[model samples]
Target chain A: CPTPWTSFQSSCYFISTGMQSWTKSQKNCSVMGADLVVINTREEQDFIIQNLKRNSSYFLGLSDPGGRRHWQWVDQTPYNENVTFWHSGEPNNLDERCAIINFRSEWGWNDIHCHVPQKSICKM
Target chain B: SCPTPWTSFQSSCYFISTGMQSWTKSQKNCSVMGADLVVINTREEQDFIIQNLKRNSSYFLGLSDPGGRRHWQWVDQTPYNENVTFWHSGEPNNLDERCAIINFRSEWGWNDIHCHVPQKSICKMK
Candidate 1:
């Protein structure tokens, strides 16, 4: 276990300040015996948002890697647009189909390029 | 209470704009609305402003080196501290521009640029 992860309702969360591409971040989390944080509740989401750094982006484990235009969670589950916290006019499905939480949107999810480097959170 | 289009947080309201204007003009604009260029007092307030900055673009702050280069001060007469301020590495490096701006393009930190340069700005009212 990471030495100082914070415990939320039912999971331990580790927020990283280090920067890496979304793919690399996921792998790093896996190597640490955790996965990219899967936000399943508003309370959990608000907790993460409150701790986010300024002007920084964080990778969440949601993406449409296959280009089928379908977003999937790290657990291989379908993403529900209505239930999720997406920024307004987001998921433009532009180019690189990866999801990130940005500060400007107040920690709301924004679909961005996968190649972009950013901080991330891990959960176990 | 904040007016329409102004976002409220922590006893203050902020007006973020994409419209570019000189530092002087921006300050004037804020005064016209009974507000002032944003004056950040803490990291949380700074973070809030940074998050609301349009695309992390340059935005004017009420800080400047009116006394002398590196002798920074806020327009509202709030105390200035080097250790407390968030300046980019090697910033306030030049004396050419005395006005301060939170620049995002070259690392998200405070920078001193010419007051006449046009850039986006944020206004705040309590």
Candidate 2:
């Protein structure tokens, strides 16, 4: 509900341009009573994509933190594969434990190491 | 994986046909392949579909208001949200016994037409 945050439906989003580790970015969002953005619809994804800087990577709220291999949202909701926008051959389930929306791949979700520095979007 | 020639996007695959057929027939054709007429849930999916359609072409959508004009629902059993509308200015007149069609124009907005009309359709499956 503050300036610089774009309102959509029942939530507002704030885009952070500076790079940070996924954990650090998560802390930044939590300080503001928010969390890394969780995409629930195509419209919301498109909105984030259009407003984001092209060719820059951004972290999403999805990850397999427990290394149990099952992915989840920051809010603890299960990641719904049927509604995802993963890049082809992604979530490769490699060593990467966190998810990033890679602009280089047309904003498709890609799994990456959580320590990688990237900008992130926050939702409240 | 989907059959050869079917295009994949996100979690679902799609088949866009060149041949024309009535809405009912088109739905049946999709059924023959274990699919149904396309049921779009987001603007990105709609954009992908519009890009694959012919310019200015109208295609049948997997949506209808069988219970009533305003009670539109997708073939997937999801009810339409008026707030998430993708209609052209002044659309869905809700005239009478009409079904939904997506116009592949600038906005890719929805329109209502008689169910018997022949047109191309895009089929989708997860």
Candidate 3:
């Protein structure tokens, strides 16, 4: 369960299913009340990972606050390039580029390996 | 508000009703939208999950991004093995890791402490 809940725009979407390491998936989505999964605009990160659902892959809220180019969202705000979705060799060169969401079939967005599990989504 | 909005794929959806900072629980999704327990991939994922028919606990991804690594957003991309599910060995040394998500009726995905908080989710849900 790398984050898995959705009720169609009612709210909830996540991905990060067992690959631990984005600081332990943000202290495990802050003791399960929630934290990671932040995308500000590509129409809200392309409507939550291009509407996910090839077989589904989800996780978002955005990151990279520690190495500090200042990509944020632990309730901090800043970084809204009309929202965002940097695929095609994005934020690479590994300063822990940090970002997730892609349902393949060529969905969109990546920059991963935060430990390594795949598959997630959530909402309430 | 655990972050806010709602547009629909053309864009938006989220949750993290608020437990605060992964650093406090880390700022509601991203300084604002809201987060905790991340998840994706579905039948449409059952048309964006409205039918958890009560076998109980597949509640995952109402939010969850991490309790470990530094950070990265998530959304189904599958086939697994980004490295065979690590569980952080002797327990996320170098100061405890983090990753959050659970549903309990046996959805499995757990972690605890770090201001030891609870529950979250939010989005631009236009």
Candidate 4:
């Protein structure tokens, strides 16, 4: 929770200034000794969005690689949360496998192509 | 087990400060150490904490009635259920005392004390 990182519930999060693809973003997070944010709870989700720009969509850890519709976190965890913040009609296409938050609404989530360059959030 | 001076309990590391300070300064030391004041979330954790402390020594906890009126919150910004508490009987009675402490007045549980009181505090890290 030092410089460039914000603390929430004993966990520290870092928001990237530059945009990168999903794979590149995850690699960058790993370089920082953290993983792409795996939003687990409603409180964590709310906390994350508040730190967001409200205008930019940030990459989340979740993605269904190769359009398999099998969403998994960067840490290889599945999407089994009770409180997902997807915007209605989101993840409409299998080609859109990567998930990003702050889409459509400041707190909503949407899926897009994995190769798309976007700002990312990482958690430790 | 968990670094040289920090004690390992479950998945976290705890540092018990020997120096006395107000809750404000105490928390700052923890922040400087890449940690925060300890926040007890389980009965087993509570038990482990009590055993490690001096029988009569008072140590500041992370929970506090920040604005009084019985509203309590942990320093880590997690939602706490009020119904799940380990308060000593007839304790936390003072509205003016905002900071919480353990082992106050009888090996009792948590007690509301003024934040300005100089006491040993526990800091924790994940």
Cα lDDT for residue B8, candidate 4: 90
**How well does each candidate superpose onto the true structure, as a TM-score?**
0.38, 0.39, 0.17, 0.39
State how far residue B112 of model 2 sits from its true place (Å).
Answer: 60
lDDT per residue (tens digit) for residues A3-117 in model 2: 9898888888999998999889989998998888777676887888777877788887765443212333222334444654333333232243566775542457655577989
> After superposing candidate 1, which stretches have Cα over 4 Å from the reference?
A1-124, B67-97, B105-107
Error of 1 at A1 (Å): 76
- In model 2, what lDDT does residue A67 have? 20
lDDT of 1 by residue, B1-126 (tens): 689988898999999867899987988888888888877666677778777775548887765434223333222234544443322233333323356677665235665567788989888888
Residue B89 of model 1 has an lDDT of: 35
What's every prediction's RMSD, in angstroms? 20.3, 19.3, 24.4, 22.3
lDDT of model 2 at position A106: 45
Q: Give the lowest summed-lDDT range of ten residues in model 2 chain A.
A: A67-76
Clashing pairs in 1: none
What are the per-residue Cα lDDT tens digits for candidate 3 across A3-73?
35543344565544554555666667666766666444445545565545566444444444343222333
Tens digits of per-residue lDDT, candidate 2, B1-126, equal: 679979888999999966778777888888899888887766698788877887757777776434223333322234445464333333333323445666644344666557788888889888
Task: Give me the runs in candidate 2 sitting further than 4 Å from their true place.
Answer: A67-96, B1-126
Report every candidate's CA lDDT.
0.65, 0.68, 0.40, 0.68
Find the candidate with the highest DockQ and give its number: 3
